Amino acid sequence: PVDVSVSIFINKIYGVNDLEQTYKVDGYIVAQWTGKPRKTPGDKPLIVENTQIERWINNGLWVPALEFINVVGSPDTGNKRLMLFPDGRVIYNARFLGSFSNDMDFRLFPFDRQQFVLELEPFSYNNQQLRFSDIQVYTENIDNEEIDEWWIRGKASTHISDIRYDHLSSVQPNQNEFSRITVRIDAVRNPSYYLWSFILPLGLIIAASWSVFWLESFSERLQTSFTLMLTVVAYAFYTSNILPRLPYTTVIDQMIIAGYGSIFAAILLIIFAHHRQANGVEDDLLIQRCRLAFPLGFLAIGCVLVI
Amino acid sequence: PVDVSVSIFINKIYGVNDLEQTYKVDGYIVAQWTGKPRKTPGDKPLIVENTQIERWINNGLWVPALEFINVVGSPDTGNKRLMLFPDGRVIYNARFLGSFSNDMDFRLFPFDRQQFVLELEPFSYNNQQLRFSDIQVYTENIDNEEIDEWWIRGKASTHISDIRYDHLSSVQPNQNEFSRITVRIDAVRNPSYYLWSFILPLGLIIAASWSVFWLESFSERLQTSFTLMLTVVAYAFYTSNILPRLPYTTVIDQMIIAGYGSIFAAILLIIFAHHRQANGVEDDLLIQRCRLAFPLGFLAIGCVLVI
Amino acid sequence: PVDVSVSIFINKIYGVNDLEQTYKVDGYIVAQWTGKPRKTPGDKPLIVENTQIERWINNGLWVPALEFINVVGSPDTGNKRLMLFPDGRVIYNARFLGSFSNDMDFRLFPFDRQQFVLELEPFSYNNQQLRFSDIQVYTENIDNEEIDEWWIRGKASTHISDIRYDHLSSVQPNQNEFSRITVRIDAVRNPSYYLWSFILPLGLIIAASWSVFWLESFSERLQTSFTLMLTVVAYAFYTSNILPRLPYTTVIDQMIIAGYGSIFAAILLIIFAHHRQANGVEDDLLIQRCRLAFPLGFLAIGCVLVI
Amino acid sequence: PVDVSVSIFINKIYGVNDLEQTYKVDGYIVAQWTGKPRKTPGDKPLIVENTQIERWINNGLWVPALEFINVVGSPDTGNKRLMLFPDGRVIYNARFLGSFSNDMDFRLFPFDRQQFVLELEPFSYNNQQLRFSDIQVYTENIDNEEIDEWWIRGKASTHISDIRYDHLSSVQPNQNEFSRITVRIDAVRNPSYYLWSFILPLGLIIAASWSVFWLESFSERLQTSFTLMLTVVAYAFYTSNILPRLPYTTVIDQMIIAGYGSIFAAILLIIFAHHRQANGVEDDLLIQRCRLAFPLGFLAIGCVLVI
Amino acid sequence: PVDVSVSIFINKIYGVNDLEQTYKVDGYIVAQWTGKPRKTPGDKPLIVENTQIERWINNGLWVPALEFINVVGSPDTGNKRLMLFPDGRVIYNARFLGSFSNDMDFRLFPFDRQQFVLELEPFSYNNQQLRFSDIQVYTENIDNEEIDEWWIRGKASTHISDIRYDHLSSVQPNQNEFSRITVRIDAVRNPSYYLWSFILPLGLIIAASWSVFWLESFSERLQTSFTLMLTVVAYAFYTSNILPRLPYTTVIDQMIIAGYGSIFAAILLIIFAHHRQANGVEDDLLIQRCRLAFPLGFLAIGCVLVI
């Protein structure tokens, strides 16, 4: 079994696609192993670049293909090079930009946190072993973080493991285990923007809707709710267009649904206070009570949301 | 007739395009057959990868082209390999990402269910037979389902069949039958998100639209309807922007049309009650009767929609 | 002049682009002609696939290049094969997906009808003749039509013709005429969705805008129109976002312009009735007359639109 | 210096990108020159297509590379051919679809006019001269123009010129002038659609915004302006979504600003008339005077816009 | 160490992607060095174009690969040429279109300024030195600037430097320093468009929101505020749709937040003025005081934003 030392340099992780749970990874991949020694020009290690690489493979050079398991589509490899050492060492280095897949839970959207993972595996050989994996995720940790959309927490975690493929041929008596390198990078989304421009005005609108009970007439109370109703419909739009599309509801969405209910419940209480008492009494002890209680009932439901 | 065994590993099904009735399929495809035996290095099976494969084809190796019938454009093939066994067996294994077509009816959008199908066929040979197809659609069934957008119902259904092409040449006496593999995976859309954030407020708005009869004056009844009319127009927008575009009306759209109809009929009844009775009588027994009947008439019409 | 027989299988025509007047065509293309006889393996017709095809061309095989004249960008050819017959016949067969251009008039948008055309022509040879064209547009005609967006009317029409190129070199004495195959498929757009979800509510709003005259006060009449005015501005949006972008006005767009005019003319009549009569008379014989006449005047102008 | 005759056939100019000032050009490019005579099959001119072309270049055939100077990215070349004459003439013919760049001023958007230009230049040779350029822009001039988005004014203008590159090597004593072909096609945008569906209703709303002065009360005057204000805010949206994005303001945009100014100035005048006269006189000679003057003040400012 | 002279011609910088912090660069790249002399046809420098280039590399020609460090994905290279001088000089010249990454701060969006940088480095050699870098950023400086979206300030800054790579193999004793060319182009965004069509009406709306205090009744004051609230929500949409998406708040967005705050504070003050005084007094000295103070309090807060 050949010992392969790999190294993955991660320049930038960007372009998170929430609809498809993908993310782009630009960087380099390096792999080193030692083979049969070789006659080189003079005796320094030889450099073979791009199109010249396959010429050496046509003459018999063994270069194994390592596949990104969780990739989404063939990645774009930039320049690639072979470094042929006289003592037998061989170093493959290639620039790449690829889109990778992983299960991503966005339910607590403004305050959510995700991990971007890479999974590397030889495509055809199980009799070949990844000896050690070193990643260099040397993007900043204390340079730009509050300004950046994502907060990288710690240095990336590595784990070389063995995957057992059961469904295989009938000619391998026992060789159905492959070497898989798994890189994981944890990050927390910066909620600063979504708080100020989305969660804050959504709070401002929800609160001001309770000011309908400070209207004196009943006609003023019920008609105003429908203009407030329209405003909630409009603010759900301003969010949904900018906010990413999802198959599920976020925290902000729960806030929006709470809006529709607070206004509809206000419409109920406003109409309830009118026709609850006999002979047309307006139950003014309700309008003034819920004038402050209706603000309080919403705050109590919000904490059981975090139950 | 050559016996060809295929195996299709499905990693992820995503990216449903409702406008064009298409869907993306990422995974692997493996094909094995036995030909004339071959001298290999030593005698272990030889592995030939990517660019090296066509070198063997140029020297005479027969590798048939298998085409996805219902594909939409040439698929993106990642790494590909040939496993040449000394006894004559040949194993082709390749990663692919492709977009596939099938007839998809989205009319009952929030609660719809579809089946994603693959159709595989040799491009040039009918004297060559697909012997058995094993698919490994080992995406989850009981891990994330309520969280995931689609619910896979059962393991994929397979069907090897024979397609008769009539319009052909004049030189084939009887050989116009080709082997087609047809895989089918049934899935149900998770309506959770579309219910809470779209159907519920649409119900809240449609329901609250009936509270126009609880206003006392006629001027209040007719003018408020125009503000409610605007809200339904706005809510049709909020839906149409996020919801996928379709050549037909969905359930939600019928609800929207029911919204427009519920409001317009109220305007008729509101104007009807004013000028229906002689000498300016306001038919107060109608406003109060339809005060509860108008909510019920909508609920009664909704059940005949499910007729 | 070499005799070449072509056949075009059309699997699916989709993806109509109204801004650029283009549409996608997926299917197969087959071409057969007879050349000098040939020594084949044994004596069965030889099948040459994809990358192996150009190998035969390098050794002298004559395979003319056929170009889609009205294509928009080089088409995506999937698998391609050569079937080499011993008697001299040669069969080229290839799967293709291409984008094609044609003049498309969308002015009567919901109810418009178009025809998708293909134009095939040899790229370099006039001393070589297309003998007959048979198309197999065996997409359904009576399976899904009310559910499908477009209605195919009849079997596709074919026409091989001759195009005269004047601007050419100075060395051709008379050879400036090339063989062009022209296929045409006529189709009518299904307006069901645009009627129910777009044309129907647009009528409801236009009609209900006339109910402003059933308001008793003049202040009620003029102020409500501005809320109705805003509604028409909003509904032009809901259409324009979903509806395709065009360089000209459609039927629906003409409907919207009538909306702005119906509301603006009402504002004029509402203000006219106020200040037309001496000493502040409100010309009540106008408000009630146009109470039904304003609905009728719109219906009368609509028929002269179809003049 | 070799004499090269070019000819450019333009099938369709489409896909104007206003954000990046680019446009797509589908058509053909032909080039002819005479070299050393040549032995051809029999003695007819030989035709070499696509993949076969580079075979002749590897054997020594001189085929210079002509670059589109103002191209945006490598263009999509379809089929390509070489016509080799026995007397030495060589004819290269190729289909292409490319995106081209030019400086475009969109400030007068609905009524603007542009010119589409191509610039062709040899990539490596200055000792080789483009002898004459003939373009065949045989797209219609009197077929579809009012229906088409753009109006081609005249036949394309041509200009072969010499471009002096100063910053070059130190080994060329004087050879730093290259032959550039410059083709120009003038076109005027058809404003029909943008007039009816955008400029017309924008006038209707701006005009109808002035109808606030025919309201009797002061409370009616001030509150309605805010609904008109929202309507202008809404109509600015309807335009901006459909209208192209630009780094500068168009004519329609100037109309919108005049709208906000017409409404904001109205809001100022409405509050001014209330509190301008001592002891609460309502300055009724202002409301009626600007009832007609405010439409005129807007019309007076509009002509100085075309100053 | 080989001395390599590069020259970078920049035709156009466009297509800034604010989501991914990228920008497109179209232009040419030239590189010259001197090697062992060479026998050329006759003795003039030989020109080798495109596909013919690798032919010389297969025969042994040393052409180093130079990689764009801050590129995002492999760039699109148009035509490429080699100029082989007899004395040993070699000139590589190629057209390219590439997307480049750099840290870009958009927080002061309308009035922001950025610098577009390029970083060039050999892909495999440290024993080869970039001798001097000359850029020809000869895009206009005084032709169209007020019309153009970006303002280039000065001639581009260059800097060849040495980057020390630590994490390397174990066989290099001290050779871990590479030559990096760094080009920087500073530019200021033209705020003309964003000022007129976005910041101005936002001021007009924010200012006109203070006119709610000129209403006489309390019911007029509170109900109108909810109509103004909707306008700010709508105007937050009109901005967000056209304006580029960002992970943080811009100046305009801060202005939007101030809008929501100015309106909500008015709603508090409007409700505060009603119920602040004993026995239902309406505190008329506040509505009139904040009638002008609320405009001033907003202006006072705005200057501390630029603190």
Numbering used by the authors:
A (entry chain E), B (entry chain D), C (entry chain C), D (entry chain B), E (entry chain A): 11 to 317
Paper text:
During activation of a pentameric ligand-gated ion channel (pLGIC), the binding of agonists promotes the opening of a selective ion conduction pore at a distance of more than 50 Å away from the binding sites. Each subunit consists of a predominantly β-stranded extracellular domain and an α-helical transmembrane pore, which interact via an extended interface. Whereas ELIC forms a cation-selective channel with high conductance that is activated with high efficacy by the primary amines cysteamine, propylamine, and GABA, the cation-selective GLIC is activated by protons and inhibited by bulky positively charged compounds that also act as open channel blockers of the nAChR. Our study has identified a cluster of interacting residues located at the β1-β2 turn, the β6-β7 loop and the pre-M1 region of the extracellular domain, and the M2-M3 loop of the pore that exert a strong influence on channel function.
When mutating Thr28 in ELIC to aspartate, thereby introducing a negative charge that is present in many family members, the EC50 of channel activation shifts to a 45 times lower agonist concentration (18 μM). A similar increase in the affinity was observed in ITC experiments, where the agonist binds with a Keff of 90 μM, a 90-fold decrease in concentration compared to WT, while the binding of the antagonist acetylcholine was unchanged. Patch clamp recordings already show considerable basal activity of this mutant in the absence of ligand and increased currents upon ligand application, whereas no basal activity is observed in WT. The single channel conductance of the mutant is similar to WT, but the current density is lower in both two-electrode voltage clamp and patch clamp experiments. All experiments suggest that this mutant stabilizes a high affinity state with respect to ligand binding, and we were thus interested whether it would be sufficient to change the crystallization behavior and allow us to determine the structure of ELIC in a different conformation. While we succeeded in obtaining crystals of the T28D mutant in the same conditions, they exhibited poorer diffraction than WT and only allowed us to collect data at 4.5 Å in the absence and 9.5 Å in the presence of ligand. The structures indicate that, despite the drastic impact on the potency of the ligand, the mutant crystallized in the familiar nonconducting conformation, which further underlines the stability of this state in a crystalline environment. The role of this interaction in channel activation and the destabilization of the resting state is underlined by a mutation of the respective threonine to aspartate in ELIC, which strongly increases the potency for the agonist and where the channel shows increased basal activity, which is not observed in WT. This basal activity demonstrates that ELIC can, in principle, also open in the absence of agonist and thus underlines the validity of the MWC model also for this channel.
